[PDB]
Amino acid sequence: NDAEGVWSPDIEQSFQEALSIYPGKMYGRNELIARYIKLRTGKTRTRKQVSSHIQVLAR
């Protein structure tokens, strides 16, 4: 292969810009789940209760 040439300075600069633009994680997910529950049931559950519930169900 190469690595030095595969990731040349111009490519590496574009790569870092794309890494800062496109995240690895879905931001605002717990708020979206809390909103969906509210619209569907009419009941209020917070982003924090949603986050805590995801952790309990994953363990």
From Swiss-Prot:
Superkingdom in the source lineage: Eukaryota
PTM comment, free text: Lactylation by AARS1 promotes nuclear localization and stabilization of YAP1, leading to increased Hippo signaling pathway. Delactylated by SIRT1.
DNA-binding region: 1-59
Disulphide bond pairs: none
Subcellular location(s) per record: Nucleus
Tissue distribution of the protein: Preferentially expressed in skeletal muscle. Lower levels in pancreas, placenta, and heart.
Coiled coil spans: none
Subunit structure, as described in the record: Interacts with YAP1 and WWTR1/TAZ.
Function: Transcription factor which plays a key role in the Hippo signaling pathway, a pathway involved in organ size control and tumor suppression by restricting proliferation and promoting apoptosis. The core of this pathway is composed of a kinase cascade wherein MST1/MST2, in complex with its regulatory protein SAV1, phosphorylates and activates LATS1/2 in complex with its regulatory protein MOB1, which in turn phosphorylates and inactivates YAP1 oncoprotein and WWTR1/TAZ.
Associated clinical condition: Sveinsson chorioretinal atrophy: Characterized by symmetrical lesions radiating from the optic disk involving the retina and the choroid.
Protein's UniProt name: Transcriptional enhancer factor TEF-1
Source organism of the structure: Homo sapiens (Human)
Gene for this chain: TEAD1
Covered range of the whole protein: 29 to 99 of 426
